[PDB]
Design a protein around this ligand. Sequence first.
Ligand SMILES: NC(=O)[C@H]1CCCN(C(=O)[C@H]2CCOc3ccc(Cl)cc32)C1
Ligand SMILES: [Zn+2]
Length: 139
Amino acid sequence: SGAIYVGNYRVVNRHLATHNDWANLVWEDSSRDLLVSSTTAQGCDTIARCDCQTGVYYCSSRRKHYPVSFSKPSLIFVEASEYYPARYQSHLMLAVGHSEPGDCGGILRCQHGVVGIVSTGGNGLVGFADVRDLLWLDE
Ligand SMILES: NC(=O)[C@H]1CCCN(C(=O)[C@H]2CCOc3ccc(Cl)cc32)C1
Ligand SMILES: [Zn+2]
């Protein structure tokens, strides 16, 4: 579990969105596993607007932060699950690192701010759903 709170927006994994998220829906994309809902309180997170390929992510299954090198956002095949059929997920970045089911929602950050959230993982890999191209999160 985990979310990005920026301005009047809350960014979460689409497969983990609540009834409230859907009732206050701004935008959602199954192909990216992202959902953005509206909030009344103001959000304190800063979003990075960069092309960094290094950063630090929070891993709840280890209660620790880990430094990672990660790939550029791309279309990567993701196995079937209770949430989705087998498909290509877009804007996804992979890194060599630990992750387990339950780690989705962990934030990835570089020196510029929030880069994305854990969305996939397994086999010593961890996948992050990028949010740097969503320029409208700030305005
Ligand atoms: N379609 C997706 O983005 C997700 C939906 C939930 C399920 N997905 C995963 O990748 C699961 C499958 C099992 O192994 C792991 C290990 C670590 C992590 Cl962070 C996630 C998973 C795909
Ligand atoms: Zn950066």
